[PDB]
RNA sequence: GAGCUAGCCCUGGCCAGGGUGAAGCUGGGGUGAGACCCAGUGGAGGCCCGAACCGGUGGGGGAUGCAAACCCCUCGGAUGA
RNA sequence: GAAUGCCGGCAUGAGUAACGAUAAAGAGGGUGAGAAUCCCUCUCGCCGUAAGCCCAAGGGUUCCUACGCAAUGGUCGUCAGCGUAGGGUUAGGCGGGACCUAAGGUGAAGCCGAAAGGCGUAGCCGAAGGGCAGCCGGUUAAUAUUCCGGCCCUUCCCGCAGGUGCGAUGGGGGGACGCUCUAGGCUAGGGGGACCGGAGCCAUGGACGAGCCCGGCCAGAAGCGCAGGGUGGGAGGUAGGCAAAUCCGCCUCCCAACAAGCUCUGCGUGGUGGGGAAGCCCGGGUGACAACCCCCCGAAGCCAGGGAGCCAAGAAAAGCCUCUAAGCACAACCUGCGGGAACCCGUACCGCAAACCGACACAGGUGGGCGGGUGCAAGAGCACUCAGGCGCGCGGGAGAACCCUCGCCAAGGAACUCUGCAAGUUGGCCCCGUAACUUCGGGAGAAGGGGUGCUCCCUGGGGUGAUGAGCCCCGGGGAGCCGCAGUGAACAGGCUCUGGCGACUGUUUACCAAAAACACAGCUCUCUGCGAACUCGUAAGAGGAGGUAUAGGGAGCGACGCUUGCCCGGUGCCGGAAGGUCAAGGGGAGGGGUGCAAGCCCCGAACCGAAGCCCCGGUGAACGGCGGCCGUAACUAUAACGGUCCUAAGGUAGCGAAAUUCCUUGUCGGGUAAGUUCCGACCUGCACGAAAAGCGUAACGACCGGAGCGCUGUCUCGGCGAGGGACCCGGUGAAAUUGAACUGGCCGUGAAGAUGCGGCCUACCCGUGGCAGGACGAAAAGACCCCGUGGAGCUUUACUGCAGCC
RNA sequence: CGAUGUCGGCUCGUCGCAUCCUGGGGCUGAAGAAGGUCCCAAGGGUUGGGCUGUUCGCCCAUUAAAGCGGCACGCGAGCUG
RNA sequence: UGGGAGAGGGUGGUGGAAUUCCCGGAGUAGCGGUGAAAUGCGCAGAUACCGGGAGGAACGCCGAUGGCGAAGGCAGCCACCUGGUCCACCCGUGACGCUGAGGCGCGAAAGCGUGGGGAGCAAACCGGAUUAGAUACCCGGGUAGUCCACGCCCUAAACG
RNA sequence: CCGAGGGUAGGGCCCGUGACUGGGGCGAAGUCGUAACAAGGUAGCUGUACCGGAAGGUGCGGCUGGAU
């Protein structure tokens, strides 16, 4: 049947993208957290 | 004169449709339409605030002239009478001798070709708008301003009307379509006659899909839900109300009055409604 | 977190073929005029049969599966909520 | 040494299940250390509204080539979507951007919020919508509307010429729109040709033929032709389109008006440029100076912004045109012509899938276009086939039980069983014919029956052309022929009678319930006068609604028909300016503390003082409720009638052993040989009953009862046969489970059901195919039950708060 | 209770005997035939259907007879539901 | 041809009396009702009185033993539309007549459907009396209906 | 070919019969009331409507075949 992951490059960037995260107090804590943890990627990769 | 159908489907049995006999023009005035943003009952938060709305036919909004004191003394010809999906009444296209064009809601008996005019000097004839104080007592009237220069608020639905009962100082007394007796200021405008398309109320929708066309999504009974949803939810099998009949939000819904206690317009309501 | 699912909003798309034959219109009849009857025309409908498409009724299989819901047969809707 | 402990390693089950669609393979020749599995050829089979082809998304080098085979590939591998390396994606016109707006998002103004932030007009952003200029062929191992060739075109800059009051984010026009049905004319696509071009072919009995086989086109500027779309012209007045306006709007006049004219698309032709088969020979080369012609069918596509009808009444903005404003009229715009200029990103490959989403090269899921031919009434259905693509990444044998999927069956024909569950039967089309009842539509495909192939002959009408021939679409009559059988294969209703429930089409528990549940048109009550009520929000602001009582919210009931009775004492709601009670506040009789005193400080009675409650009324389609005991008629029985107690009032009409009846398989009748079910009745209704509606109702139902006909492997009662497995051999090789095991029966015993204790009996060691009685077999720390001063959802006249409202 | 699946049916049996039939008997209020009752006897046999989920029971048509009980109300790693 | 009388019919207007209700004033201990009473209403200010307002229905005197119509039936007043009928004249047609199975139309009240309207009245219904009872008569209430529009029903002691 | 008739299927009329059910006629001396005949003690009758153990009552309109 139809499963749950239905990839969509625009959807992905508009929802979890860097700019979405910066626009919001909770989103900025996410970036602040993932930098402090030392994540190699702050934000999902999506080819645009 | 509502139109019937022969029973060639289950729903055609009872369905009735409007005669559309007064309509003389079947596409709207391009300079007077603008798109009607369908809401679905959702507010600026995105939340449903009015249940069971959505999914009806697309519509354009016809801009209606609810002031008419815009153009005191300038006659106009009744150019056509058209269908308006945003209201129950029909609308009339007016060609002012100005060159300006406007829609008003069409009173009963208004004829294509006649002239209407607005102002304190206007004849007491169907279609003419006057300040309330200048209309003789007894005259049946529609599209009545509630406050001066604020716009026609009362008696706009198909077939409705208000009647002038008397005068008292700066105020005339109207019998509204609800049978309420209220004082309305005399400088308020109103249009002689009753709204047309009085047969509107005898339309038998006929089937569920006909309600879907008007943007009415199915209404589910509280008794059909669960306690998390409604005061009437739950019970094994069917169940009487089991409490004073209530709304989804708990308030009682069989008699509980809800007009605000200390509202300033109470000094102007003379007598509450009827039947 | 509404890329699953539920509802709504905006903008596009899709629905083989066949069957039934409403209103109206025309002609004829009828009548004081009518209602109305007959024929033709017409092509209405949460109309009928049936693919795509959307479903998931009964049974059988499958049950460390091909599959964390599938497969075969059969069955519902298919211009409409 | 134990924690169903944790991490790791390795066992057992076991050479066991399995190796992922039953579309299918065989052989020859290559290559190579090695070949069922790679390459080539021939034969065979499978898809063909796809299992072929083209877009979009998603994926991200998987593309092409050389070299490889450790791992990946369910076997093998020399092969590969794998490893290494090198190569490969070319645009003014295709798509997106330098253009426009949609929902929505954002947001100078402004508004609101402890903070974070929430709103918000313009504006901005935002597309698969609007707008906008490229077609055909060739070429590469791999890109091509991109390179090349031919023929076309767009914008920007500059110049020349001609023309004009030029000029805009401003005004206007236009853009600009639904659904169903649909006209004319075309094109796509297709069928045929005794005509045209072609390498050839004559077989095995015949055929050298009006034979067979292959092919008979594509693109094209101007011009022209056909078919369509769009569009009135002039004058005068003018107060409207938030300045102006010669534009637009409104009024009057004349003229043109089934036209014309102007303009714009489609199609045809068109200089020109291309293409070009079978077969043979080695993707090529030939064929070939290839030929490129006629007839027919014909779109859902095109002309298009076409026409008609209908009601539910069907985006915006830019480009474009027109009007003017400042301004400027050495400018500027418009038209024609010339030269110049023309950027950024994508482009490989897969794309119904082995490259996307499903942990897998996973029988699942994935939007758009093309989708040939013949026959079957039609069609995208079905059968077979074209182009094209495949045989599904373990095989070889054997021919047991048993399982799956499939075929047939004597006589019987539902006797099966909870149930005809399942499987038969019926099955398309044409004609005849068709009942109760009905809301007059229907019920209806009711039921039931006849026909169906082929040949010859005569013949009607419609399309094309010309009226004819030919082609074509529907028929009509007559006479024959063959078989068991003519919708000869494939696809394609079993029917009737009678109940319950629900009017109906719809909706639902994604993944055990599709229903009688939900919804539904319709009915009623109730709230709401507009800054509505109501809803979301602290608010601002929204929705309601750019609506206004024929409207909007809430509730119940549920098409339609006939109806919906009595009770207002309790709860609710509504009304009530009196009275009672009533908080803060006012009032201050009278007290108290302290000070020498003035004073300062504290307590405080009467009395005035809201909503609410009390109290007085109303109200049922508001919550709800609608009796008991005893007697009585000239046979008996029964009780129309009476007595008395109680209530706020004692259940009406209609219906009833019911989706409700406990006693119950009530009693009687029907149907059956026989009927705890069914249907019809009766009424002592344990415990129906009138909008949690009552009683009916044509039509409808994958709902749930009961019966009959048809027909059957359901059954008596099984038999045989097919294939896929099971079995044997080669390759690859799991799993749950497992204290260890050298693991028999009986009768006893034991914590009460013993392989393991006692007594007796029986028993050589080890496997393979099978069956399921035991190992209180496995799985899941019982989902029932209880316990825990464990948890959570839900309720209310439980407690206590809070929002909200007064 | 860190799980002993729970009615009936179907299939497959096996056992007890307090015996339904068949075999052998005694008594009889046993004339015969047919019964009644008790004793011995478990070798074999003990039908098909209508109703109901039913066990049981009632009924139809037969029969020599249409037995009663146990085996975890025998038997769901055998099926049904 | 010339005239006449008439509640003949349909439509649109519109006038005054009265009842009810609401508002304002004045005023107080009862009102109402019957055979008699009670229920009911009234110090939360009723009845009775005045002024104001809303609304529905029916039209007093004239009015009669009257008039009109085919019957059912028709009554304030005004206008419009329209039928029947009678008299005068003796002008026109030239028996063109009578009746009339079927057919068609009209048809009091009640009743029905869909909207409206609703003052008074009032089936049902509730209460108070009466009574052996009183599902009646009498009293207090009271819903359909009575009214309007359109569509039905088609009955009658539709009788002279 | 037609054809007695037989068979299959579906209709129409009539007759008999049926649990139960509707009212009707009749029947020396049953139970309840007293509706009508007198102004029958509420004049009666009437079409219709609703209601009630029953005759009946009531509403609306009509008749005199009503008394004083
Ligand atoms: C309760 O549910 C426990 C369950 C056993 C556990 C281990 C379990 O969950 C087993 C599941 C199984 C075997 C699932 C099978 C597969 O189903 C399919 O799975 C795939 C992933 C899914 O995509 C679907 O495929 C399409 C899904 O299909 C549904 C499934 C196949 C049918 O099998 C089952 O469902 C079997 C399951 O019911 C199993 C037998 C259960 O064990 C029994 O549990 C019950 C509770 C217990 O009985 C109780 C009944 C009582 C309480 O009344 C009492 O009388 C008895 C004594 O206990 C029973 N046992 C007696 C203990 C267990 O055997
Ligand atoms: Mg899904
Ligand atoms: Mg998606
Ligand atoms: Mg995207
Ligand atoms: Mg996208
Ligand atoms: Mg997206
Ligand atoms: Mg976001
Ligand atoms: Mg982002
Ligand atoms: Mg912050
Ligand atoms: Mg910060
Ligand atoms: Mg890094
Ligand atoms: Mg990053
Ligand atoms: Mg992130
Ligand atoms: Mg109709
Ligand atoms: Mg009809
Ligand atoms: Mg109209
Ligand atoms: Mg516009
Ligand atoms: Mg809005
Ligand atoms: Mg918003
Ligand atoms: Mg709501
Ligand atoms: Mg809504
Ligand atoms: Mg409206
Ligand atoms: Mg309208
Ligand atoms: Mg006012
Ligand atoms: Mg209505
Ligand atoms: Mg609508
Ligand atoms: Mg509902
Ligand atoms: Mg419920
Ligand atoms: Mg529920
Ligand atoms: Mg919730
Ligand atoms: Mg709650
Ligand atoms: Mg609740
Ligand atoms: Mg409840
Ligand atoms: Mg309950
Ligand atoms: Mg419930
Ligand atoms: Mg219940
Ligand atoms: Mg429920
Ligand atoms: Mg209750
Ligand atoms: Mg409540
Ligand atoms: Mg409230
Ligand atoms: Mg009011
Ligand atoms: Mg979604
Ligand atoms: Mg999305
Ligand atoms: Mg369709
Ligand atoms: Mg079609
Ligand atoms: Mg047909
Ligand atoms: Mg026809
Ligand atoms: Mg027409
Ligand atoms: Mg349909
Ligand atoms: Mg059919
Ligand atoms: Mg089946
Ligand atoms: Mg399947
Ligand atoms: Mg199938
Ligand atoms: Mg169908
Ligand atoms: Mg269809
Ligand atoms: Mg449609
Ligand atoms: Mg230890
Ligand atoms: Mg473990
Ligand atoms: Mg542990
Ligand atoms: Mg571990
Ligand atoms: Mg571990
Ligand atoms: Mg380990
Ligand atoms: Mg390690
Ligand atoms: Mg290991
Ligand atoms: Mg091993
Ligand atoms: Mg084994
Ligand atoms: Mg396995
Ligand atoms: Mg497997
Ligand atoms: Mg596998
Ligand atoms: Mg298959
Ligand atoms: Mg071979
Ligand atoms: Mg081979
Ligand atoms: Mg090999
Ligand atoms: Mg090899
Ligand atoms: Mg192979
Ligand atoms: Mg090969
Ligand atoms: Mg060969
Ligand atoms: Mg094909
Ligand atoms: Mg390898
Ligand atoms: Mg290898
Ligand atoms: Mg290597
Ligand atoms: Mg491997
Ligand atoms: Mg694999
Ligand atoms: Mg090699
Ligand atoms: Mg490449
Ligand atoms: Mg180019
Ligand atoms: Mg630039
Ligand atoms: Mg954006
Ligand atoms: Mg675009
Ligand atoms: Mg483009
Ligand atoms: Mg081109
Ligand atoms: Mg190319
Ligand atoms: Mg110019
Ligand atoms: Mg337009
Ligand atoms: Mg528009
Ligand atoms: Mg559009
Ligand atoms: Mg339509
Ligand atoms: Mg072409
Ligand atoms: Mg063809
Ligand atoms: Mg001018
Ligand atoms: Mg001007
Ligand atoms: Mg060639
Ligand atoms: Mg050559
Ligand atoms: Mg199409
Ligand atoms: Mg078009
Ligand atoms: Mg806009
Ligand atoms: Mg200037
Ligand atoms: Mg100059
Ligand atoms: Mg640039
Ligand atoms: Mg490319
Ligand atoms: Mg697929
Ligand atoms: Mg596709
Ligand atoms: Mg592939
Ligand atoms: Mg594979
Ligand atoms: Mg796959
Ligand atoms: Mg095809
Ligand atoms: Mg072809
Ligand atoms: Mg066919
Ligand atoms: Mg197609
Ligand atoms: Mg294969
Ligand atoms: Mg396949
Ligand atoms: Mg395979
Ligand atoms: Mg073998
Ligand atoms: Mg198969
Ligand atoms: Mg055979
Ligand atoms: Mg047989
Ligand atoms: Mg049979
Ligand atoms: Mg038979
Ligand atoms: Mg049976
Ligand atoms: Mg059955
Ligand atoms: Mg069943
Ligand atoms: Mg068939
Ligand atoms: Mg019948
Ligand atoms: Mg019939
Ligand atoms: Mg029938
Ligand atoms: Mg019937
Ligand atoms: Mg009929
Ligand atoms: Mg038939
Ligand atoms: Mg037929
Ligand atoms: Mg024939
Ligand atoms: Mg033949
Ligand atoms: Mg023969
Ligand atoms: Mg069928
Ligand atoms: Mg239903
Ligand atoms: Mg249902
Ligand atoms: Mg029902
Ligand atoms: Mg119904
Ligand atoms: Mg319904
Ligand atoms: Mg449907
Ligand atoms: Mg579930
Ligand atoms: Mg489910
Ligand atoms: Mg689930
Ligand atoms: Mg269910
Ligand atoms: Mg269903
Ligand atoms: Mg439901
Ligand atoms: Mg329904
Ligand atoms: Mg109803
Ligand atoms: Mg209503
Ligand atoms: Mg709120
Ligand atoms: Mg705050
Ligand atoms: Mg708005
Ligand atoms: Mg419902
Ligand atoms: Mg009926
Ligand atoms: Mg009460
Ligand atoms: Mg009360
Ligand atoms: Mg009460
Ligand atoms: Mg109570
Ligand atoms: Mg009743
Ligand atoms: Mg009963
Ligand atoms: Mg019974
Ligand atoms: Mg019943
Ligand atoms: Mg009951
Ligand atoms: Mg019972
Ligand atoms: Mg029982
Ligand atoms: Mg019985
Ligand atoms: Mg019987
Ligand atoms: Mg049953
Ligand atoms: Mg009884
Ligand atoms: Mg209820
Ligand atoms: Mg109930
Ligand atoms: Mg029915
Ligand atoms: Mg259904
Ligand atoms: Mg169903
Ligand atoms: Mg049967
Ligand atoms: Mg068998
Ligand atoms: Mg076999
Ligand atoms: Mg061997
Ligand atoms: Mg091996
Ligand atoms: Mg391997
Ligand atoms: Mg050991
Ligand atoms: Mg050992
Ligand atoms: Mg052993
Ligand atoms: Mg042993
Ligand atoms: Mg023991
Ligand atoms: Mg033992
Ligand atoms: Mg042992
Ligand atoms: Mg030992
Ligand atoms: Mg021992
Ligand atoms: Mg031992
Ligand atoms: Mg021993
Ligand atoms: Mg032994
Ligand atoms: Mg073996
Ligand atoms: Mg074995
Ligand atoms: Mg075993
Ligand atoms: Mg065991
Ligand atoms: Mg155990
Ligand atoms: Mg066991
Ligand atoms: Mg635990
Ligand atoms: Mg436990
Ligand atoms: Mg558990
Ligand atoms: Mg559970
Ligand atoms: Mg317990
Ligand atoms: Mg406690
Ligand atoms: Mg404790
Ligand atoms: Mg607790
Ligand atoms: Mg709080
Ligand atoms: Mg236990
Ligand atoms: Mg365990
Ligand atoms: Mg266990
Ligand atoms: Mg059996
Ligand atoms: Mg024996
Ligand atoms: Mg038992
Ligand atoms: Mg029993
Ligand atoms: Mg014997
Ligand atoms: Mg036994
Ligand atoms: Mg027991
Ligand atoms: Mg027991
Ligand atoms: Mg047992
Ligand atoms: Mg058992
Ligand atoms: Mg089982
Ligand atoms: Mg069992
Ligand atoms: Mg077991
Ligand atoms: Mg077992
Ligand atoms: Mg076991
Ligand atoms: Mg069950
Ligand atoms: Mg008093
Ligand atoms: Mg006082
Ligand atoms: Mg009134
Ligand atoms: Mg007269
Ligand atoms: Mg004369
Ligand atoms: Mg009448
Ligand atoms: Mg007395
Ligand atoms: Mg014979
Ligand atoms: Mg009397
Ligand atoms: Mg008397
Ligand atoms: Mg009397
Ligand atoms: Mg009475």
mmCIF file of N, CA and C (backbone and C1' of nucleotides) in Angstrom, chain D residues 294-309:
data_model
loop_
_atom_site.group_PDB
_atom_site.id
_atom_site.type_symbol
_atom_site.label_atom_id
_atom_site.label_comp_id
_atom_site.label_asym_id
_atom_site.label_seq_id
_atom_site.Cartn_x
_atom_site.Cartn_y
_atom_site.Cartn_z
ATOM 1 P P C D 294 -3.889 11.316 -55.040
ATOM 2 O "O5'" C D 294 -4.934 10.137 -55.269
ATOM 3 C "C5'" C D 294 -5.659 10.024 -56.483
ATOM 4 C "C4'" C D 294 -6.545 8.798 -56.497
ATOM 5 C "C3'" C D 294 -7.604 8.713 -55.412
ATOM 6 O "O3'" C D 294 -8.754 9.490 -55.686
ATOM 7 C "C1'" C D 294 -6.500 6.635 -55.598
ATOM 8 P P C D 295 -9.669 10.009 -54.473
ATOM 9 O "O5'" C D 295 -10.318 8.674 -53.890
ATOM 10 C "C5'" C D 295 -11.328 7.984 -54.611
ATOM 11 C "C4'" C D 295 -11.865 6.795 -53.850
ATOM 12 C "C3'" C D 295 -12.361 7.062 -52.437
ATOM 13 O "O3'" C D 295 -13.667 7.601 -52.397
ATOM 14 C "C1'" C D 295 -10.974 5.164 -52.426
ATOM 15 P P C D 296 -14.116 8.541 -51.171
ATOM 16 O "O5'" C D 296 -14.167 7.555 -49.917
ATOM 17 C "C5'" C D 296 -15.165 6.549 -49.829
ATOM 18 C "C4'" C D 296 -14.839 5.521 -48.775
ATOM 19 C "C3'" C D 296 -14.875 5.995 -47.335
ATOM 20 O "O3'" C D 296 -16.185 6.071 -46.817
ATOM 21 C "C1'" C D 296 -12.948 4.673 -47.686
ATOM 22 P P C D 297 -16.549 7.231 -45.777
ATOM 23 O "O5'" C D 297 -16.096 6.644 -44.368
ATOM 24 C "C5'" C D 297 -16.533 5.371 -43.924
ATOM 25 C "C4'" C D 297 -15.785 4.954 -42.686
ATOM 26 C "C3'" C D 297 -15.678 6.005 -41.590
ATOM 27 O "O3'" C D 297 -16.843 6.104 -40.787
ATOM 28 C "C1'" C D 297 -13.560 5.032 -41.951
ATOM 29 P P G D 298 -17.395 7.546 -40.331
ATOM 30 O "O5'" G D 298 -16.217 8.137 -39.440
ATOM 31 C "C5'" G D 298 -15.744 7.463 -38.283
ATOM 32 C "C4'" G D 298 -14.519 8.147 -37.741
ATOM 33 C "C3'" G D 298 -14.603 9.662 -37.668
ATOM 34 O "O3'" G D 298 -15.312 10.146 -36.539
ATOM 35 C "C1'" G D 298 -12.587 9.060 -38.709
ATOM 36 P P A D 299 -15.912 11.637 -36.578
ATOM 37 O "O5'" A D 299 -14.691 12.529 -36.091
ATOM 38 C "C5'" A D 299 -14.641 13.021 -34.765
ATOM 39 C "C4'" A D 299 -14.022 12.030 -33.809
ATOM 40 C "C3'" A D 299 -13.741 12.585 -32.424
ATOM 41 O "O3'" A D 299 -14.871 12.416 -31.590
ATOM 42 C "C1'" A D 299 -11.823 11.434 -33.254
ATOM 43 P P A D 300 -15.548 13.660 -30.852
ATOM 44 O "O5'" A D 300 -14.546 13.961 -29.666
ATOM 45 C "C5'" A D 300 -15.016 14.471 -28.432
ATOM 46 C "C4'" A D 300 -13.946 14.378 -27.383
ATOM 47 C "C3'" A D 300 -12.529 14.690 -27.873
ATOM 48 O "O3'" A D 300 -11.828 15.384 -26.845
ATOM 49 C "C1'" A D 300 -12.565 12.570 -26.864
ATOM 50 P P G D 301 -11.521 16.942 -27.005
ATOM 51 O "O5'" G D 301 -10.227 16.967 -27.933
ATOM 52 C "C5'" G D 301 -8.940 16.685 -27.402
ATOM 53 C "C4'" G D 301 -7.861 16.936 -28.425
ATOM 54 C "C3'" G D 301 -8.015 18.223 -29.209
ATOM 55 O "O3'" G D 301 -7.424 19.318 -28.541
ATOM 56 C "C1'" G D 301 -7.691 16.426 -30.707
ATOM 57 P P C D 302 -8.128 20.757 -28.586
ATOM 58 O "O5'" C D 302 -7.936 21.227 -30.092
ATOM 59 C "C5'" C D 302 -6.638 21.434 -30.624
ATOM 60 C "C4'" C D 302 -6.707 21.888 -32.055
ATOM 61 C "C3'" C D 302 -7.641 23.049 -32.326
ATOM 62 O "O3'" C D 302 -7.040 24.288 -32.016
ATOM 63 C "C1'" C D 302 -7.995 21.358 -33.935
ATOM 64 P P C D 303 -7.898 25.489 -31.393
ATOM 65 O "O5'" C D 303 -8.688 26.120 -32.629
ATOM 66 C "C5'" C D 303 -8.016 26.717 -33.730
ATOM 67 C "C4'" C D 303 -8.969 26.978 -34.871
ATOM 68 C "C3'" C D 303 -10.219 27.783 -34.535
ATOM 69 O "O3'" C D 303 -10.006 29.176 -34.648
ATOM 70 C "C1'" C D 303 -10.804 25.878 -35.835
ATOM 71 P P A D 304 -9.492 30.084 -33.436
ATOM 72 O "O5'" A D 304 -10.397 29.692 -32.189
ATOM 73 C "C5'" A D 304 -10.327 30.455 -30.987
ATOM 74 C "C4'" A D 304 -10.878 29.709 -29.798
ATOM 75 C "C3'" A D 304 -10.176 28.400 -29.471
ATOM 76 O "O3'" A D 304 -10.296 28.150 -28.070
ATOM 77 C "C1'" A D 304 -12.408 27.962 -30.135
ATOM 78 P P G D 305 -9.588 29.132 -27.006
ATOM 79 O "O5'" G D 305 -10.726 30.182 -26.631
ATOM 80 C "C5'" G D 305 -11.833 29.782 -25.834
ATOM 81 C "C4'" G D 305 -12.930 30.812 -25.824
ATOM 82 C "C3'" G D 305 -13.728 30.931 -27.117
ATOM 83 O "O3'" G D 305 -15.105 31.111 -26.808
ATOM 84 C "C1'" G D 305 -12.762 33.029 -26.573
ATOM 85 P P G D 306 -16.100 29.861 -26.950
ATOM 86 O "O5'" G D 306 -16.151 29.560 -28.515
ATOM 87 C "C5'" G D 306 -16.418 30.580 -29.465
ATOM 88 C "C4'" G D 306 -17.362 30.100 -30.540
ATOM 89 C "C3'" G D 306 -18.764 29.760 -30.078
ATOM 90 O "O3'" G D 306 -19.580 30.897 -29.900
ATOM 91 C "C1'" G D 306 -17.979 28.018 -31.438
ATOM 92 P P G D 307 -20.780 30.848 -28.839
ATOM 93 O "O5'" G D 307 -21.793 29.785 -29.465
ATOM 94 C "C5'" G D 307 -22.555 30.082 -30.625
ATOM 95 C "C4'" G D 307 -23.579 29.005 -30.893
ATOM 96 C "C3'" G D 307 -24.590 28.749 -29.780
ATOM 97 O "O3'" G D 307 -25.706 29.621 -29.834
ATOM 98 C "C1'" G D 307 -23.628 26.705 -30.440
ATOM 99 P P A D 308 -26.441 30.100 -28.485
ATOM 100 O "O5'" A D 308 -27.181 28.786 -27.980
ATOM 101 C "C5'" A D 308 -28.335 28.320 -28.664
ATOM 102 C "C4'" A D 308 -28.771 26.952 -28.196
ATOM 103 C "C3'" A D 308 -29.279 26.857 -26.767
ATOM 104 O "O3'" A D 308 -30.619 27.276 -26.625
ATOM 105 C "C1'" A D 308 -27.754 25.115 -27.155
ATOM 106 P P G D 309 -31.025 28.205 -25.386
ATOM 107 O "O5'" G D 309 -31.213 27.174 -24.189
ATOM 108 C "C5'" G D 309 -32.186 26.147 -24.272
ATOM 109 C "C4'" G D 309 -31.789 24.948 -23.453
ATOM 110 C "C3'" G D 309 -31.698 25.154 -21.952
ATOM 111 O "O3'" G D 309 -32.957 25.179 -21.316
ATOM 112 C "C1'" G D 309 -29.810 23.961 -22.677
#
